[PDB]
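Appendix B: complex inputs.
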Amino acid sequence: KDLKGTKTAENLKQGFIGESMANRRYLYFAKRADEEGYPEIAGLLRSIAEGETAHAFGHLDFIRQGGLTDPATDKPIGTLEQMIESAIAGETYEWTQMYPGFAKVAREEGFPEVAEWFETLARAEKSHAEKFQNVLKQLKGG
Amino acid sequence: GHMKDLKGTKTAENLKQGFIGESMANRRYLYFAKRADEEGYPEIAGLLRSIAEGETAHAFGHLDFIRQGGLTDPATDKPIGTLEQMIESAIAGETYEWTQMYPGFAKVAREEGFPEVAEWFETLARAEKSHAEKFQNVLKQLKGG
Ligand SMILES: [Cl-]
Ligand SMILES: [Cl-]
Ligand code: NI
Ligand code: NI
Ligand code: NI
Ligand code: NI
Ligand code: NI
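Resulting structure:
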């Protein structure tokens, strides 16, 4: 059956978001176990994080096979070119809108160090966008 | 200045949203890299994997500001200051997933006529239950000394 417009389409999206966060969280936690001398705990966090990678990738497989869009950008991700276009769209949103906006709010609320971080990130995502744009030119132009 | 209280601020909400987006970016770019791999684009795949390391650094930095600002884990709304608290956050999210989120997703998938997706969600419910048990075993290690 067609997944478009179903609740299952939404649940694959929110499964993807949670899986993505779980992998990042567990690898961040592992580095604390590392410094404190808990190699078995760190190893378990790393191995379970591989599980969450598998989960996230499986959600994306169903999304792509179903003709659903990228959770992050609402752009198709069927072909490699589409995947690069999805990357460009996300990076563009981040540098032109999201991170500058976060920076302005941080400065206005009295958090200059957080604002500086968001402005670093905006410059980083702009750099990423440019790099991906150069890939798209290669792919689209053969 | 790193320990300024962020509770209640719009900046707290923005750090959480930034962490979500960074998390997804790393997963997406490593997924895309595998498509570039099979098709024979190693420079594209390598760029995707290197940019993914950037998004790891971003995500981890967001987590640093979240913890230092006295904020909670974006995924679980639990404190993640100490290692013990980090494992308790892992257990809380695993518990939500196996007791509620994935079983509910599987029921809706079956109702909507997606039995293959339902089977996948059921597999994941069992997986997150196994993860919860293994983290519970570790926590008992930490608290026992
Ligand atoms: Cl250990
Ligand atoms: Cl290449
Ligand atoms: Ni998972
Ligand atoms: Ni980026
Ligand atoms: Ni300070
Ligand atoms: Ni980023
Ligand atoms: Ni899990």
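The helical segments of chain B are 10-39, 42-68, 83-111, 115-144.
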